[PDB]
Amino acid sequence: SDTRLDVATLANAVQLAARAPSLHNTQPWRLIAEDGELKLFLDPSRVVRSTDRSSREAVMSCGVLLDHLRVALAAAGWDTEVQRFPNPNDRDHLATLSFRPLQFVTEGHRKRADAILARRTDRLPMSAYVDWDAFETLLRARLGDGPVHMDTLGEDVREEVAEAAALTESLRLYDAAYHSELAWWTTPFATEDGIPQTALISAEESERVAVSRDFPVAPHSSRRPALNNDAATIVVLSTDGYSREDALDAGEGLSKVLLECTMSGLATCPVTHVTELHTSRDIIGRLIVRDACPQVLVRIGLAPALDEVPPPTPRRPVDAFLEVRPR
Numbered sequence: 001s002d003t004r005l006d007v008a009t010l011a012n013a014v015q016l017a018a019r020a021p022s023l024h025n026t027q028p029w030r031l032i033a034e035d036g037e038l039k040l041f042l043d044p045s046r047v048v049r050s051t052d053r054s055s056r057e058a059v060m061s062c063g064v065l066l067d068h069l070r071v072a073l074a075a076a077g078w079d080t081e082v083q084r085f086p087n088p089n090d091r092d093h094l095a096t097l098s099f100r101p102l103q104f105v106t107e108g109h110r111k112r113a114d115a116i117l118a119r120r121t122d123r124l125p126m127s128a129y130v131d132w133d134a135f136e137t138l139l140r141a142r143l144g145d146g147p148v149h150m151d152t153l154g155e156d157v158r159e160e161v162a163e164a165a166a167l168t169e170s171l172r173l174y175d176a177a178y179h180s181e182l183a184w185w186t187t188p189f190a191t192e193d194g195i196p197q198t199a200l201i202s203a204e205e206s207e208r209v210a211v212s213r214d215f216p217v218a219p220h221s222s223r224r225p226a227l228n229n230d231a232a233t234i235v236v237l238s239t240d241g242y243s244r245e246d247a248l249d250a251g252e253g254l255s256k257v258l259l260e261c262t263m264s265g266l267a268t269c270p271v272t273h274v275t276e277l278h279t280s281r282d283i284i285g286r287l288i289v290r291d292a293c294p295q296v297l298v299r300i301g302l303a304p305a306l307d308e309v310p311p312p313t314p315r316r317p318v319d320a321f322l323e324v325r326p327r
């Protein structure tokens with residue numbers, strides 16, 4: 001029996017992995033534990049319909065969960081093997097995971113699982129990380145030979161990205177659905193999902209972060225007043241194409257990047273609205289290497305170490321999204 005992953009350990013790893021980030025904290029994943037395996041499905045009811053064409057970011061978010069689950073399970077002593085899109089007749093079935101014991105859990109495994117708990121999205125301005133170059137080498141080693149590529153944008157294109165962001169908001173001015181979705185998923189009365197007020201920034205703070213999606217403003221505040229402008233390094237993660245398979249890959253890559261950043265004490269913030277429209281995404285495409293499809297931007301930098309840290313954003317309980325089917 002000792003080579004079969006047990007429910008308690010699986011569920012504990014799911015509880016940890018569910019810290020994964022997701023578009024608007026929608027957590028659009030469904031899991032089924034059955035016959036010793038774990039099936040990962042998109043939850044179509046939790047797709048942000050106008051915002052996220054083709055459910056790309058919902059699938060991406062599930063990819064982030066996929067990688068998180070692997071990380072969580074490794075720290076628990078379990079290796080994971082993944083079959084992606086195992087059922088041509090159900091494109092909502094994104095992956096099936098199977099498990100085998102590791103011989104030992106490394107310090108790396110532990111630190112990476114600690115990073116899952118520590119990571120948060122930080123929408124305040126950041127300082128640039130002075131030892132970026134050496135860190136970029138670590139990030140690239142983690143991403144290996146694909147399927148997700150990363151471009152580090154030069155400071156000389158920061159304004160172009162900012163203007164692509166503004167263009168995106170302009171194109172959404174009359175998209176009522178986008179605006180109602182943004183309101184919905186930022187309602188202050190949500191408790192298990194959505195973006196809480198403590199995770200949002202004030203109008204004044206927003207003036208100081210050029211690369212951002214506009215969200216409803218939090219109550220007035222002027223945090224990190226020493227930083228007149230965000231100086232985060234901007235990286236773009238991209239894939240060969242824009243299929244569901246590519247979306248899933250993108251999310252696994254995004255998870256790897258966010259966790260690597262967190263393990264090195266770096267602040268992160270994904271920015272995706274510039275990838276949600278053709279016009280915007282093509283602008284970002286021209287900033288990156290030939291033939292690559294931009295999937296997500298990440299701001300990477302330093303937060304002030306003694307800043308108070310907002311509380312964790314909420315997650316759904318595991319019994320909302322994990323089914324266990326008896327043998």
Ligand SMILES: Cc1cc2c(cc1C)N(C[C@H](O)[C@H](O)[C@H](O)COP(=O)(O)O)c1[nH]c(=O)[nH]c(=O)c1N2
Nearest residue numbers: 021022023024025057120121213270271272273313
């Ligand atoms: C695919 C996807 C897309 C986005 C994000 C994430 C992911 C995975 N999130 C961040 C997101 O809102 C955040 O992860 C959740 O609110 C949960 O909060 P924590 O990340 O745990 O702090 C994000 N945040 C942001 O400031 N701008 C954005 O455009 C987006 N969009």
